Amino acid sequence: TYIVSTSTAFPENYYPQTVLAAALRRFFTVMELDFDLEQIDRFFTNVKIDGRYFALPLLLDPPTWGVSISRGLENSLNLAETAITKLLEKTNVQPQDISLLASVSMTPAIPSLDGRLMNRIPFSSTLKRLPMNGVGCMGGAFGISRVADYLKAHPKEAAILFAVEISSALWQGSLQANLTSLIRRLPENPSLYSEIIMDIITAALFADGCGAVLMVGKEHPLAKSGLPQVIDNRSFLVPNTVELMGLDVVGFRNILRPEVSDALKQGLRPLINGLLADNNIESENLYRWIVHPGGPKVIDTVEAEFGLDSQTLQLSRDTLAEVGNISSATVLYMLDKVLSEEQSPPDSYGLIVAMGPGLAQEAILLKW
Amino acid sequence: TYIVSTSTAFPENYYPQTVLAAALRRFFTVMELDFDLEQIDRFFTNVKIDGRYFALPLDSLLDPPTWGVSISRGLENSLNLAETAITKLLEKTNVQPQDISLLASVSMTPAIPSLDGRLMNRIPFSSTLKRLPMNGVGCMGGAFGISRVADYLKAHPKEAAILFAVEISSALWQGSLQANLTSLIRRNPSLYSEIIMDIITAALFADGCGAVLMVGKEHPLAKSGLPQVIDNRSFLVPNTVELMGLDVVGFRNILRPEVSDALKQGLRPLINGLLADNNIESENLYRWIVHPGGPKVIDTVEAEFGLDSQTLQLSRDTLAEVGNISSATVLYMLDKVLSEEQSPPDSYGLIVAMGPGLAQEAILLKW
Numbered sequence A: 001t002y003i004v005s006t007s008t009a010f011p012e013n014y015y016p017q018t019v020l021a022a023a024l025r026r027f028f029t030v031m032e033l034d035f036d037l038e039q040i041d042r043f044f045t046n047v048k049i050d051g052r053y054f055a056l057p058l059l060l061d062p063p064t065w066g067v068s069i070s071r072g073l074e075n076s077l078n079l080a081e082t083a084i085t086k087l088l089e090k091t092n093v094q095p096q097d098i099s100l101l102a103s104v105s106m107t108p109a110i111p112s113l114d115g116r117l118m119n120r121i122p123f124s125s126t127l128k129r130l131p132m133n134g135v136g137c138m139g140g141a142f143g144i145s146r147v148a149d150y151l152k153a154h155p156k157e158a159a160i161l162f163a164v165e166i167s168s169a170l171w172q173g174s175l176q177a178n179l180t181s182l183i184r185r186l187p188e189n190p191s192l193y194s195e196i197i198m199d200i201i202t203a204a205l206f207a208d209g210c211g212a213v214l215m216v217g218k219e220h221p222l223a224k225s226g227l228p229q230v231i232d233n234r235s236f237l238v239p240n241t242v243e244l245m246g247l248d249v250v251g252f253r254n255i256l257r258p259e260v261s262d263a264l265k266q267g268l269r270p271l272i273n274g275l276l277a278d279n280n281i282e283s284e285n286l287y288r289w290i291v292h293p294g295g296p297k298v299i300d301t302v303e304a305e306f307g308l309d310s311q312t313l314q315l316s317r318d319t320l321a322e323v324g325n326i327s328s329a330t331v332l333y334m335l336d337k338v339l340s341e342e343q344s345p346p347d348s349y350g351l352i353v354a355m356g357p358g359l360a361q362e363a364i365l366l367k368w
Numbered sequence B: 001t002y003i004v005s006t007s008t009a010f011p012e013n014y015y016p017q018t019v020l021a022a023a024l025r026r027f028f029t030v031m032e033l034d035f036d037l038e039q040i041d042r043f044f045t046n047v048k049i050d051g052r053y054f055a056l057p058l059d060s061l062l063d064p065p066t067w068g069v070s071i072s073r074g075l076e077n078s079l080n081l082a083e084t085a086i087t088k089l090l091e092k093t094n095v096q097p098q099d100i101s102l103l104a105s106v107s108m109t110p111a112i113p114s115l116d117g118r119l120m121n122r123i124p125f126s127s128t129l130k131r132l133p134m135n136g137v138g139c140m141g142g143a144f145g146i147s148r149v150a151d152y153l154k155a156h157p158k159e160a161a162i163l164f165a166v167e168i169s170s171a172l173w174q175g176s177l178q179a180n181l182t183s184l185i186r187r188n189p190s191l192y193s194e195i196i197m198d199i200i201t202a203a204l205f206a207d208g209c210g211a212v213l214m215v216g217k218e219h220p221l222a223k224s225g226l227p228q229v230i231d232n233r234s235f236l237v238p239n240t241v242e243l244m245g246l247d248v249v250g251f252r253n254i255l256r257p258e259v260s261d262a263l264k265q266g267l268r269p270l271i272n273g274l275l276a277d278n279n280i281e282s283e284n285l286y287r288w289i290v291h292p293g294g295p296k297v298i299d300t301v302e303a304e305f306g307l308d309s310q311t312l313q314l315s316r317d318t319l320a321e322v323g324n325i326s327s328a329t330v331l332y333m334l335d336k337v338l339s340e341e342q343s344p345p346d347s348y349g350l351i352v353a354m355g356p357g358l359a360q361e362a363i364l365l366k367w
Ligand SMILES: CCCC[C@H](Cl)CCCCC(=O)SCCNC(C)=O
Pocket: A068, A069, A071, A072, A073, A106, A107, A108, A135, A136, A137, A138, A165, A166, A167, A168, A169, A170, A206, A245, A246, A247, A252, A254, A255, A326, A327, A328, A356, A357, B112
């Protein structure tokens, strides 16, 4: 399977990280929440993000959850349509010649976003769809793997994957309600301190955006040398870590416990060592890593586990700095950057790695 | 690709339709809602459901728990049902979990991580198990998942995959229907249609789980006499998103009366195109397995294809026994066919389901 091209789409409002930190501090202050405001600055600074796109409005006067979901759906569709149209235009592919449209998003959508897009883009009415959910930050890498598996059996076909997330939905009421309750119960329940920090970290980290990728089977006319080929992929799920990472219905609450970066270690090396060995490759001979930046702590952990030079994962840090954590879309944005870089040397190997709720990890071996 | 075996799983409480009708009437009465109570009984009777399984409680109908606690219970019941069905499937086929390569799931139960990921802590699947967690397909999910697993197994002829579908319709009885029927009846003659649609939702949808084991052609279990998936196809009717789906409000089920008429735009284009490309006609089909997805749907398929009054009886009997269990329904029906019926060698069958989109899915089977 060949990765042919990529595109991204972002909403119109880009906020400096310092403005978002200030917006949350003002919420704490207007609400008279008894909490150290310097903790907001600390985590908004320590995530190493310069600014974020928010599709939904920037705390004090929240709409109904129904209205926020309606806006989230609309914005998800708008971003996905933009990305897919840019993708089709840049490759000169007609929508009717796409066989499969795969999607990942935690935006609630029944019918799925990919079905609603059939009314915006003239796909054939018999388009095959692959709407995935329950994978969180991992979804971009996960979707690449599932589409590659599909194209194994359909070598003449073309498929599009998109990932789109609206993290700003959490700023429409969920973060406000939860931080208020937690901080006000904190004097009688000091165990809640870590819960407040988790919500502040969520507010510091997650952003909005969309990425899309065109992939084709080996017999497709766009399967040309010089493109990255997906040569293998593998999944891993670490036992008994469901509670470390997820998205719970309450609005929503993001779950991201500090123990993630250590539980990551239990899955990363068996997953990647096994994938590489089964393909007769040594990690030291990888030309490129494309690692989803769950956080700076996650990047540091991957770097330490595989003894990497600190420049090897620079793309993860630059991406975090530019757009924040855009969840499943992040590795597609990252792949897009790489496809804009200098033509990778022939026969160079690359690894895409992402981690998400599960705790689950996905690894994809690429060859140029 | 072969369908090797099926299983089902249901919660402990089976309620007669009259008991459910009575509970809803009691709600209208305690709340002093000004609405003809005979509309409740008429719709609960006219869907021709004898009873339904509810995993979530009915006794709290007047004082429902919080939506957060309902979701947590819905997750736990979803996991329990899927674990039970999967375990029965593995036991009846003598297949070890470690020997399953792909676990595919469909469910509207909110789950991040997905149900299939969570199930890896209850069933000793390999840690490198491949997963296919689908959503956004509603009632079409069981047929949809069969097609997607079939496409996967085309590329993996040595492998075995499990699909499960599970839905907890009783979630809507934990506050959503109560709130919406109250407000709607209070308020605007144009709102009569909205109340009817919530009453029909309350009359129709039920809980359950189905599971299927499928293998590629080179798997040891791939044996003659098992149904083969020979082809499958999807169809989405343009500009009908608003006719069916599930909206966040709790949840509100959307099922517009126009659905059955809108199905006519997709059914024959889908099925006759699929059959023609496999060199057969619909009249060649020995068995139909059609999801019973809302008023007039069965009747509409029957009319479109000129079928005899008994060709779709399995749809009606299924609705009678367990109601509309959404994505799981066609797996329960396939289970009945494989376990209780005789299928002549080399005969053709068609699985058909319809769901939010408006989308339809067809799968051609050959024994
Ligand atoms: C508008 C529709 C509502 C969208 C809801 Cl709020 C999706 C959550 C968005 C925030 C994230 O993407 S958090 C990514 C890391 N979290 C996990 C579980 O991996």
